Amino acid sequence: NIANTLMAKALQECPNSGILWSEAIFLEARPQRRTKSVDALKKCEHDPH
């Protein structure tokens, strides 16, 4: 959970981070990995990661 809080702080302070977003996909549980974790992410950026 603390990892999730730190990831939320990191994304808020540093958006458009390809590696951070890619890793935040796999912090989130499987039900929420697609509908919210990767859609708005692809909206944010298109990094190779």
Part in contact with RNA (CB under 7 A); list of ranges 9-17, 18-26, 31-39, 41-49? 31-39
Under rule CB under 7 A, residue 48 binds RNA: no
Tell me which of 3, 16, 25, 36 binds RNA, using CB under 7 A. Answer: 36
What is the C-alpha to C-alpha distance for residues 3 and 42, in angstroms, rounded to an integer?
22
Q: Which two tokens stand for residue 24?
A: 């935040």
Part in contact with RNA (CB under 7 A); list of ranges 3-11, 18-26, 32-40, 41-49? 32-40
What is the C-alpha to C-alpha distance for residues 20 and 15, in angstroms, rounded to an integer?
9
